[PDB]
């Protein structure tokens, strides 16, 4: 009774016995330790796209926010999820340019809304209607990026050093 839709989460036993049908819009679930797909979009060896604007509405600081962040359909294959996202943004299909899991944001050092992964995709495409996770940051440079996190964006200390040594240095 129905069909596809704006992303849906179907819970099935193992074969094809859907135990429960949870919707992304449905608040029935408790969003906190859910699964999410996050990634940083960079290209041209210098074009780093990431949110810079400060949240005047909300009342909670943060280190940094990824570029492309969405939800995982059903929940089982992170590749399929991220793929659909990268395909809808620029039909990249995460199999034309080059992508690699930079890390995983969730534990605490990152502090996000839920358990999301971090993948580095080589490209320069704008996001879509998503003002919940990240409406879409801006395209800054390497000097401005490091200069921002160092200035005062709650992305300093071990956090900044970790990225500075990971990006610049190879250790």
UniProtKB/Swiss-Prot annotation:
Pfam families in alphabetical order: NUDIX
EC number(s) stated in the UniProt entry for this protein: 3.6.1.-
Activity-regulation annotation: Inhibited by zinc, calcium or copper ions.
Record's keyword terms, sorted: Hydrolase, Magnesium, Metal-binding, Nucleotide-binding
List of residues binding Mg(2+): 85, 89
GO molecular function, one term: magnesium ion binding
Gene Ontology BP, a term: nucleotide metabolic process
EC category: hydrolase
pH-activity profile: Optimum pH is 9.0-9.5.
Domain Nudix hydrolase: 32-162
SUPFAM superfamilies: Nudix (SSF55811)
Cofactor entry: Mg(2+)
Residue ranges annotated as motif Nudix box: 69-91
Free-text function comment from the UniProt entry: Hydrolase that converts various nucleotide triphosphates (NTPs) to the corresponding nucleotide monophosphates and diphosphate, and nucleotide diphosphates to nucleotide monophosphates and inorganic phosphate. Has a marked preference for cytosine ribonucleoside 5'-diphosphate (CDP) and cytosine ribonucleoside 5'-triphosphate (CTP). Has lower activity towards the deoxyribose nucleotides dCDP and dCTP, and towards dGDP, TDP and UDP.
Family: Belongs to the Nudix hydrolase family.
Subunit structure: Monomer.
Protein name stated in the entry: Nudix hydrolase DR_0079
Source species of the chain: Deinococcus radiodurans (strain ATCC 13939 / DSM 20539 / JCM 16871 / CCUG 27074 / LMG 4051 / NBRC 15346 / NCIMB 9279 / VKM B-1422 / R1)
